[PDB]
């Protein structure tokens, strides 16, 4: 199987700059190489075939190059609609194989998160379970640490996180952390806190509430 090594796996850039994505094949594929663009919820879109031939309607700021085993997709002046994931694919020999993808992301200024805590619903407490939710709103970059304290007890292994994609106008992220406890465990403790660490902050933000 021909292996496609695509680099980088992700990159941050700004409208107007020049981005270079590389794909190296483990064997000679003689320019039988395609480049695809994929946005979330959509099928891949073919942009380039035969290493250099633009598909109809693809703006000329996209260009492909390389021979033998090394291939490059160049976006000469990055536009707002080009932020997406890009894939190379050799179709020289079966099985056809794709690169691992390059997610092109929007670069912006560091921005600290706005933190919010939500106690479990009374409606939910009758379920036998309690979910404690900490929201981190509109921050950048994506890396962030959320630590849950019960009374003070630091929790580990009973929470789950989920992150949005970059916002339409903000280029920021948001994140939710959900702490899952039993009703019995929840009603036996007082102070629930989440402590948020982010490179936009000088010291961690904590948001808490006391049952009652």
């Amino acid at each position: 199987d021909i292996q496609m090594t695509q680099s980088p796996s992700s990159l941050s850039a700004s409208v107007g700059d020049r981005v270079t994505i590389t794909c190296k094949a483990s064997d000679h594929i003689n320019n039988w190489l395609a480049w695809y663009q994929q946005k979330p919820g959509q099928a891949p879109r073919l942009l380039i075939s035969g290493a250099t031939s633009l598909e109809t309607g693809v703006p000329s700021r996209f260009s492909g190059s390389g021979t033998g085993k090394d291939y490059t997709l160049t976006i000469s002046s990055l536009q707002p609609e080009d932020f997406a994931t890009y894939y190379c694919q050799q179709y020289w020999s079966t099985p056809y194989t794709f690169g691992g993808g390059t997610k092109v992301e929007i670069k912006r200024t560091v921005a600290a998160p706005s933190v919010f805590i939500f106690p479990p619903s009374d409606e939910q407490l009758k379920s036998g379970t309690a979910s404690v939710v900490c929201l981190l709103n509109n921050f950048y970059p994506r890396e962030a640490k959320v630590q849950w304290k019960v009374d003070n007890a630091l929790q580990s292994g009973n929470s789950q996180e989920s992150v949005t994609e970059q916002d339409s106008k903000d280029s920021t992220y948001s994140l939710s952390s959900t702490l899952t406890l039993s009703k019995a465990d929840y009603e036996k403790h007082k102070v629930y806190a989440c402590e948020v660490t982010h490179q936009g902050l000088s010291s961690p933000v904590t948001k808490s509430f006391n049952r009652g």
Binding site: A34, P44, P95, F118, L135, N137, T164
Partner: protein
């Protein structure tokens, strides 16, 4: 109007079988191959195989091979993929695409989602999320399975400030996600906030006022 129309989402238990369909329209089905491409959540792309209806020739990826069968029905202008002995790793989006021997596919279907697990289809419970200048509300959509749910706010009238997070799979084998919206704290007094949650697999909808 050249397009490929794929069949609906599928939920199958481990060991079972599924047959995806892909109907051509706006071009002569028998003139082109149909290839199939797998994409599991968060992952990349995998070529499964393709079939040329005129010759019946079928090209397979040995990673599948033992379990995938490609056929084509020239009368209904429809290609099919059958995957046997489903495991959990087979859960993914499956695309069909129009292929030739000299060019990569330019026409793609919009994908069929396949879920493989033992969990049974279940509608969600909807719990409110409620507590400066800006305040935050939300809904916790919990313990639904087949996926997906859609979440709007105020019947779609409220979109600015909305954040609807990707679902996470819980240890129970059921999904859960949260949707939140930040608003001016002024409006909490005289403005109603309702999230509208739609889970088509279980045929349930829920409207939840948050206070």
């Amino acid at each position: 109007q050249v397009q490929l129309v794929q069949s609906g989402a599928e939920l199958k238990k481990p060991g079972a079988s599924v047959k995806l369909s892909c109907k051509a329209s706006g071009y002569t089905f028998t003139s082109y191959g149909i290839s199939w491409v797998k994409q599991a959540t968060g992952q990349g792309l995998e070529w499964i195989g393709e079939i040329y209806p005129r010759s019946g020739n079928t090209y397979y990826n040995e990673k599948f091979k033992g379990r995938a069968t490609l056929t084509a029905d020239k009368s209904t202008s429809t290609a099919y993929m059958e995957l046997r002995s489903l495991r959990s790793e087979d859960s993914a989006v499956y695309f069909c695409a129009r292929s030739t021997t000299v060019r990569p596919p330019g026409i793609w279907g919009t994908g069929t989602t396949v879920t493989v697990s033992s969990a049974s289809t279940k509608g969600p419970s909807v719990f409110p999320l409620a507590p400066e200048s800006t305040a935050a509300l939300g809904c916790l959509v919990k313990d639904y399975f087949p996926e997906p749910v859609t979440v709007s706010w105020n019947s779609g009238a409220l979109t600015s400030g909305v954040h609807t997070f990707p679902a996470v799979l819980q240890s129970s084998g059921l999904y859960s996600l949260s949707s939140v919206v930040t608003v001016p704290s002024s409006s909490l007094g005289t403005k109603t906030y309702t999230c509208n949650v739609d889970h088509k697999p279980s045929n349930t909808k829920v409207d939840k006022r948050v206070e």
